[PDB]
Amino acid sequence: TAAKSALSDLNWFSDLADIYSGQQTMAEMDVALKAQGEQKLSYPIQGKNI
Amino acid sequence: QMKKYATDTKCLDYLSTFRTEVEDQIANYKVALVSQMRRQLTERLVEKLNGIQQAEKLIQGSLQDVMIREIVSSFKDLYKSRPELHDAAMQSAIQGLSMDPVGAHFKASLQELAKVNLSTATADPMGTVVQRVAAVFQKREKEFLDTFTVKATEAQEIKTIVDKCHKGNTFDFHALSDEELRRLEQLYSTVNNRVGFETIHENSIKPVAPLSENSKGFVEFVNTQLEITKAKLRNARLTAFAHAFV
Amino acid sequence: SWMSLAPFVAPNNAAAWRKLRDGAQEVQTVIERQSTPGKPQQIDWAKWESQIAHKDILNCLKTFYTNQVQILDRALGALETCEGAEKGWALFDAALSACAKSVEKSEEL
Amino acid sequence: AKISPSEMSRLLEERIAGWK
Amino acid sequence: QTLEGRYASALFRVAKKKNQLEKVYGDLESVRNALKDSSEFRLFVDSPAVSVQQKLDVLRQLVNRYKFDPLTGNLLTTLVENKRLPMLARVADAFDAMYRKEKGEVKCLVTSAKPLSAQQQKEIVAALQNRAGTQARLIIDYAVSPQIMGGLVVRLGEQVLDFSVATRLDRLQSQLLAPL
């Protein structure tokens, strides 16, 4: 019943996961503010655009 | 033995490198996401054009098929009806033993067809081969355009019943609506998925899962702000969908 | 280098770590992929304008394409030059200090 | 590709000539 | 080329020179009619338990009764000694076809119903200028699938000139369903 990792109770693996997911999402939603300027669109519609 | 645990000093450099790396492995993520969107858009358009080309091809195939079938049936009628073609064919063969009415009638109908503008024509069993073939032409073209274009009834419905009833000068927001707004969203997913546009689905974003209490002060600032971005973006989407339809 | 931080994990802190690990894997599975071919798609309308007979809806579709690619390249070159994240980098720094406070304990020996 | 009335019909008309 | 073809080519290429084959042609036609009208001579060559003695005697005496030529007798003795006499009528018809083919062909021909003496004349003169064969003895027929346009076969096998309505029509239709 030995113990590797002479270091004591580690409890900072959760926070790393949380900040990783947070930075990932914050990037994902600082992207789509830019990639959806959406000036105008051109939809082909029967009777009018055709 | 303790010659083992000398590794346990190197559990501190790793975290410095964590902070140094993740602020770069992320800056090389937004770029890849942009290019992902570009790739998906391009592939969507390409598949659309392959489909539309194939449809055009099969249309013209069926067109010439019927163009031949109907001329042939017309000739099979006219021959058995008319007396003159018999002796004309006799003379034709006789002089050929050293033009026939079949090639003549075919060429005549083709020449009379080449300058018809089949769009201006009439119903299916309408006698004249042009009236027999243009029915197929127009009907097939209608069954074509409804699948790689939007229909004017779908437009009129929302344009006159849904969008402008919200608001005018800009068509601002959408909380002023019934639950049937969700159906409009479904309607969105039809149009762009027949035309072949690629718009970002905001809901592909996923919020954070809390793990421990110490993180609570961060996650909320994300998730709250995420809503402030998720709904906002929604508006900047649908206004476009409206301002094509006014 | 921080990916070689596995063996200092304990089974009470495993799934979280695994989540983190798989999270990063997702990112990397994107990036290399979206830089391996580079740009082989690059469609050329000279072909399709000819091969198609309508040339009435094709034009608007192409217009949409060229209107979106401009804004994509815009955002791309724009990001290629805060406070919302420091609230978590503080958690990271606290964890750093804790791990040093533990390694010093296990450097007595 | 090509259009039916003005092109294909002319082509097919050009195609039919043949005997012997 | 065949067996009966062998005897045919033999007697033809041997007899064309001196025999005045037309004489042989007439004698063989007489023999063919005697065959078709006897029913014992047919039996006789079928008659397998007959002595070759009686056969040879019959033939030698038949020389002195009807018209006869020497090469005819040589051939008859040949088909006797080679045990190939029942092939006699077949080789006779082979020789008839051979000689009349040297001189003039007989051809099949089809219409819908009765044509006219005028276009009949036109048909025969056109087929003659096409053949350039001075002798042509034809057939008339009525098959209405090829609607009325005159289809036929000038009898040499590799020329069935299909001047018809339905045939040109179907060939054209199946042609112009081609892609582009």
Author numbering:
A (entry chain R): 84 to 133
B (entry chain B): 321 to 418, 424 to 571
C (entry chain A): 20 to 100, 107 to 134
D (entry chain C): 52 to 71
E (entry chain G): 73 to 252
Paper quotes:
F-type ATP synthases are energy-converting membrane protein complexes that synthesize adenosine triphosphate (ATP) from ADP and inorganic phosphate. These universal enzymes function by using the energy stored in an electrochemical potential across the bioenergetic membrane by rotary catalysis.
The attachment to F1 is mediated through OSCP, which adopts a fold conserved in prokaryotic and eukaryotic homologs. Subunit-b displays structural similarity with its bacterial, algal and mammalian counterparts, engaging in conserved interactions with the C-terminal domain of OSCP as observed in other structures. Compared to the yeast and mammalian ATP synthases, T. gondii displays an augmented peripheral stalk structure with extensions in subunit-b, subunit-d and the additional ATPTG12. Instead, the apicomplexan-conserved subunit ATPTG12 forms extensive interactions with subunit-b and d throughout the peripheral stalk structure.
